[PDB]
Amino acid sequence: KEFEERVVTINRVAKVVKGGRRFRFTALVVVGDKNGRVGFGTGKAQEVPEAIKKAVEAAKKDLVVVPRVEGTTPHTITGRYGSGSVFMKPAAPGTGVIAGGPVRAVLELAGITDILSKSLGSNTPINMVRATIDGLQNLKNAEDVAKLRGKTVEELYN
Amino acid sequence: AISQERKNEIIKEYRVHETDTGSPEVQIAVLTAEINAVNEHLRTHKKDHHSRRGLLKMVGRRRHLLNYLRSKDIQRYRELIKSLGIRR
Amino acid sequence: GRRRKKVCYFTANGITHIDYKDTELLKRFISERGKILPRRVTGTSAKYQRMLTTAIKRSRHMALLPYVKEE
Amino acid sequence: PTINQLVRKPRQSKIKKSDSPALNKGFNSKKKKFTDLNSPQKRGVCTRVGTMTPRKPNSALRKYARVRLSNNIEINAYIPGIGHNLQEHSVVLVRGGRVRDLPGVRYHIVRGALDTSGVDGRRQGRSLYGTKKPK
Amino acid sequence: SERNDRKVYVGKVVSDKMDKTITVLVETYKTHKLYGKRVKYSKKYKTHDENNSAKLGDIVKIQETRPLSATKRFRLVEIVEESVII
Amino acid sequence: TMTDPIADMLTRVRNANMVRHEKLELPASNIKKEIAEILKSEGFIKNVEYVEDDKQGVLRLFLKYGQNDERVITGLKRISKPGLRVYAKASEMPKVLNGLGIALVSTSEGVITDKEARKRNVGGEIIAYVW
Amino acid sequence: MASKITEQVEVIVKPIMEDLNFELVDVEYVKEGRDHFLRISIDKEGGVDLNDCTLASEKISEAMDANDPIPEMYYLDVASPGAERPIKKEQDFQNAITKPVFVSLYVPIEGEKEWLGILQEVNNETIVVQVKIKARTKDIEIPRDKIAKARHAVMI
RNA sequence: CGACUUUCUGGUCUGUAACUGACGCUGAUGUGCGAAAGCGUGGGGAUCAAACAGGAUUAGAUACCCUGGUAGUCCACGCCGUAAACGAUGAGUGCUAAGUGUUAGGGGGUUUCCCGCCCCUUAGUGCUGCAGCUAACGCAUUAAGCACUCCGCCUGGGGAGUA
RNA sequence: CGUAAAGCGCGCGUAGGCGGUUUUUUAAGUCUGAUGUGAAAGCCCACGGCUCAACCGUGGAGGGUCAUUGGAAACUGGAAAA
RNA sequence: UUAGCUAGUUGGUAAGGUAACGGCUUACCAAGGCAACGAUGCAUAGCCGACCUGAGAGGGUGAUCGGCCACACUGGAACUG
């Protein structure tokens, strides 16, 4: 979709070698539509423009669907990856999406209105936003199973 | 030692049906004879650890079989512990 | 694997033997130095290998076999 | 743990100990009864003053002093801050603070309100350093 | 005061080593605050058998009638299951 | 010891979920039979079957995977497990993933689904969560 | 070693009394896995101002800055102690007639021998302190022969 | 826990289903068993062996390089109960791609003993690896995957296993 | 607890922990209401006053793991039957 | 790093005694009676309603205010009503 970049930070990774100490400005960008699509990316560079270039290029490739109702997930689940797990839940309107900073940016690049959420386990942004993308890729909808199950909506339904 | 000779000898009697393999009455009789034999061995084998562990587990399992015979039955248990003279 | 040696030489023997009644089969069981051709290079199953080995080691203790053999 | 052993156990936390032994007056001046008073301040005197030296490169010479508060419990405490007019056996107020200067001590004096008078030449002591608004 | 059920307690007679007095152990179990699993716990009840007619293993109900001695509180109401080796 | 039937039932169901096959059978109980019928009602088990043999008859399940052998359901777990005899009254009925997620509950008459539970409003021992 | 630290005592006792004209009553060093802690009790006047500690510490540190026969660098603890002193000699008690002292005497009270009083006058072994214990006033003659431990105390 | 043997027993499993009818479960307390050293006693001492000393070395030399010898090691029981007893993988339960062995089993067909083959599991112990999961490492039917009753620990480092 | 902190050294086993398949009863639980009964206030909700707020007040809600009884027999626990 | 407590104690007998109750206390006879599911001992403590932080779970707290309990220099009493 319309690619909207979202980097988390720029770490310099000093790959010190024989002699010199080569530090690469490493930055991971997440590219999304904030309207039902998002995708993360990784890039190791020596500067902000090179890093954003490469990581946005990587991020716009892999995307997601972000199935929502009221612009919000029809269900509630939690995301987990490598002990960087995070928890998610919808929220009543006007309350706003609440989550830790970086994963909050992830979910606004999914474009949600009101969410119960909080980061857990690891505070490393990469790991926790990866648990986040796992969870978001593990969303479904009532119609999906109303098809999948022979039974339909309005009898076994959110 | 024992083998099935004295086993069957002492199961000839307490079998609710002579083809049974539960109803530990005959079976606990076998266990009684065998623990007696292994205790003779233990008096022969003054120091070890196999006789100790074996007697532990065997007598405990037979004890629990009795407890069952006291829960499953109420008279068979006593009549054994007076006839067999074990786990009274 | 595993790393045992040839079997089916029991085409006229088995499953349990001998222990001692043919010194010549024992000539082929293990080495002749007193050292033991391992189960790695003897072959029969650890049950039969172990029983044959204790047979030959008894023969050593039985003087039917030398414990160690010289040259 | 298993549910039963969980029941026959409290699952005790790892509750800490206050690294500031701030046992304020409590029952010190009657019955000499030990009492965990958490007062932010007790009045008391530094019977002796001193000065340990820091190592290189930052030879930021820090000065200490041993003090007794209302409970009169011995401790060697460093003085921070620039400027003073007190001496041996001067009454001093000590606040809880552990700094990078020297172990064996976890408290610190405060400037401005007692014998260790602060300096009103700076503007940071506008609400603190014991000194009034620099007017 | 029979309208008042007093304090009846079905339970087993555990001892009678008192003059005309027995002890009924009536079993209960209390909830856990954090958890919800428990085990059976009870309160022994020094109780007056009118002639120490009770026996060990006697499942029996009783009746709070009067403080009869030290912790001797509950009269027997009816011997339910006076038992011997079963 | 096979302490709980729910636990082994659900762990082997999740194992089949991983292995992506449908035809599997297992020693049942009357409750296992009834809940398997509830499963076929839910659908994600395309077919269930019960016979009798030692000791309880083998319940025979034949799953309804997705169009591409995907779990129509997402998650599955026991609730009433050894030691934890956990009950839910009329209002104590939970709603895993609301209607989409479901859970049978044993009640004073029998085992009923979450829809039945909040429908006839008889609580009971909540059994196992599936979503 | 102890001989070494004594040598530093003589070499650095020069500064102390050409700088702040103090005298070191001693220099002793304690160590806990790092540059040890040479506490030098600097004397001169009794009521040493903190500045009179800062400047003296400057002097002694500069003195040893170029002087350290001891191979490693170490913490200089520059101490300008107060009048508080262990009273072993009778003159130690005589000087302290102004200030309170606490003593541990062969005849204790309530198990332990240590008691603090504020001296009113000097009377050989006998004591006319305004000893204050449990908020109690009195002049109690503590026999020095009883005294197993005696130290001049803080004035508070 | 390996020289051989026996003692009089403890345990191992294939198949077995024999049938009372859950008799099962881990297991606080308790509690046995238990490297080595050490040691009490009573012997041995074959080594070995601290300490040791002769003695290099060097005022010093046991420091080590010597020479011998050395408590004890070794026999009787206790004390010893401790360790790297470590997989820092409690036990049992049963599920779950494979390839792919073992250690005993069994069966079927396969063929002269298929022993020869294959394959099915029995019950373990492999290596690679589905999935899964771990920071990583890797396990992965013998999970570190999935679950379940029951035990203990862990709470920064270390202070100090020490008081 | 595969390695950063954690599996005795390893046992036997008392209590106890949980409890196989099926058939009934029980209602103990369990669930499932009715009762009495949860000072008050605060407590949440609404609302009244105080300019308003603060605030009290008003009522409601909430508030037992309490006792009792209505069903119920899935389940665990019994009871019985294998 | 709190495991035995335990003798009017245990129970009854008779007396008394109190609103009652009973070792409640006397005399009797008898030996109990509790004890790891932690008695006992020690520290400590007013109690709760309530309150603070916590999404909550929870944790923590226990100012006035509601009540309940304990005390009134110290101990030993008792008159009164």
G70 vs G120: CA distance, rounded Å:
48
Taking phi over 0 as left and psi of -120 to 50 as alpha, with beta for the rest, A104 belongs to: alpha
Sign of CA dihedral E69, E72, E76, E79: negative
Domain count, chain C: 1
Technique behind this structure? Answer: cryo-EM
Q: Does G79 touch chain D (CB under 8 A)?
A: yes
Residues F3 and F66 placed together within one structural domain of the fold: yes
Distance of alpha carbon C11 from alpha carbon C15, whole angstroms: 10
Residue of E3, E8, E7 lying closest to E60 (CA atoms): E8
How many whole angstroms from its chain centre is CA C6?
A: 13
Q: How many domains does chain F have?
A: 2
How many Å apart are CA F105 and CA G42, to the nearest integer? 84
Question: F49: which 2 tokens?
Answer: 């079957």
| G54 shares contact with chain D (CB less than 8 Å) | yes
CA distance F103 to B30: 51
What's the resolution in A? 4.2
**Which H or E run includes G77?**
strand G75-80
Residues 5-24/C with CB < 7 A to strand H: 7-8, 10-11, 14
C-beta separation of B14 from B29 below 8 A:
yes
**CA–CA distance, E17 with E33 (Å, rounded to integer):** 38
Task: With H, G, I as helix, E, B as strand and everything else as coil, classify residue E4.
Answer: coil
Residue whose tokens read 């084998």: B45
Closest nucleotide to E18 by C1' from CA: J11
Instruction: Give how far B62 is from chain E: nearest CA, Å.
Output: 19
Touching partners of G (3+ C-beta pairs < 8 Å): D
Q: How many domains does chain B have?
A: 1
Contact status, residue A77 vs residue A97, Cβ threshold 8 Å = no
Q: Which domain covers residue F65, as residue numbers?
A: 1-73
- The CA-based angle G99-G100-G101, given to 5 degrees, is 120
Contact call for residues E15 and E22 (beta carbons, < 8 A)? yes
F48 close to F63: Cβ distance less than 8 angstroms: no
Task: For residue A77, give every residue at least 6 positions away whose Cβ sits within 8 Å of its Cβ, in sequence order, or none.
Answer: A88, A135, A138, A139
Identify the domain containing residue C16 by its residue range: 1-70
Q: Which of D52, D84, D88 lies nearest to residue G82, judging by beta carbons?
A: D88
Which chain F residue has the Cα nearest residue E38?
Answer: F83
CA-based torsion, A58, A60, A66, A70: positive or negative: positive
Helix, strand and coil content of chain C, in percent to the nearest 5, comes to 40, 0, 60
The helix (H) or strand (E) run that includes residue G103 is strand G100-109
In angstroms, the Cα distances linking G128 to G114, G136, G153 are: 17, 14, 16
Q: What Å distances lie between residue C69 and A99, C50, C62, CA to CA? A: 82, 21, 14
Residues whose CB falls within 8 Å of the CB of residue A4, separated by 6 or more in sequence, listed in order: A31, A32, A33, A34, A109
**Closest nucleotide to the alpha carbon of C55, via C1':** H4
Q: Which chain D residue's Cα is nearest to E32? A: D7
Cβ of E71 near strand J (under 7 Å)? The reply is yes
**At residue A138, what are phi and psi to the nearest 5 degrees?**
-105, 35
For chain F residues 42-101, those near strand I by a CB cutoff of 7 A are 55-56, 80, 82-83, 85, 87-90, 92
**Domain end among F49, F73, F97:** F73
Chain mean position to CA F24: 15
Q: Which residue has the tokens 């005959």?
A: B26
Which residues on E lie below 8 Å from D7 (Cβ)?
Answer: 32, 35, 37-39
Q: Is the peptide bond before G70 cis (omega within 30 degrees of 0)?
A: no
Rg, chain G, Cα only: 19
Burial of D67 (0-12, 13-18, 19+ CB in 10 A): buried
Q: How far is the CA of G63 from the C1' of J13 (A)?
A: 99
Residues in contact with F69: Cβ distance below 8 Å, sequence separation at least 6, in sequence order: F20
**Residue F83: closest C-alpha in chain E:** E37
**Any chain E CB within 8 A of the CB of D4?**
yes
Residue E45 CA distance to nucleotide I27 C1' (Å): 26
Torsion angle, CA of C34/C38/C43/C47, rounded to 10 degrees?
90
Pairing between strand E41-48 and E72-81?
Answer: parallel
Residues of E with Cβ-Cβ distance to B74 under 8 angstroms: 86
Report phi then psi at C46, rounded to 5: -55, -30
For residue E79, give both structure tokens.
């011997």
Is A15 at the interface with chain F, CB within 8 A? no
CA G89 to chain centroid:
14
In chain E the beta strands, taken as DSSP E runs, fall at 11-18, 21-28, 41-48, 58-69, 72-81
Beta bridge partners of G115: G103
Question: Does E67 lie at the interface with F, CB-CB under 8 angstroms?
Answer: no
Query: Which DSSP letter does residue F84 get?
Result: B
The token duo for F8 is 């082994």
CA of B57: nucleotide with nearest C1': I12
Q: What is the rounded CA–CA span in Å between residue D49 and residue F1?
A: 73
- Could you check: is the Cβ of residue E48 within 7 Å of any atom of nucleic acid strand J? yes
Scanning F20-123, the segments in alpha helix (DSSP H) are 30-42, 114-120
Residue spans of the domains in chain E: they are: 1-86
Whole-number Cα distances in Å, E60 to E13, E27, E54, E67: 7, 12, 9, 19
Q: Is the CB of E18 under 7 A from strand J?
A: yes
Contact yes or no for D4 and F83 at CB 8 A: yes
Chain B / chain E CB contacts < 8 angstroms: 3
Query: What residue spans of chain F are helical by DSSP H?
Result: 5-19, 30-42, 114-120
Closest approach of chain E CAs to the CA of D9, in angstroms? 11
In angstroms, the first-to-last Cα distance of chain E is: 37
F and A interact (at least 3 Cβ pairs within 8 A)? yes
- Any chain E CB within 8 A of the CB of D13? no
Pairing of strands D90-91, D45-52: antiparallel
Could you give the CA distance from residue A116 to residue A91 in angstroms, rounded to a whole number? 6
CB contact under 8 A, A145 and F72: yes
A29/I44 CA-to-C1' distance in Å: 46
Both tokens of C17, joined, read: 């033997």
Give, as one character, the DSSP assignment of residue D124: G
Element (H, E) at D96: strand D94-96
Q: Does G81 touch chain D (CB under 8 A)?
A: yes
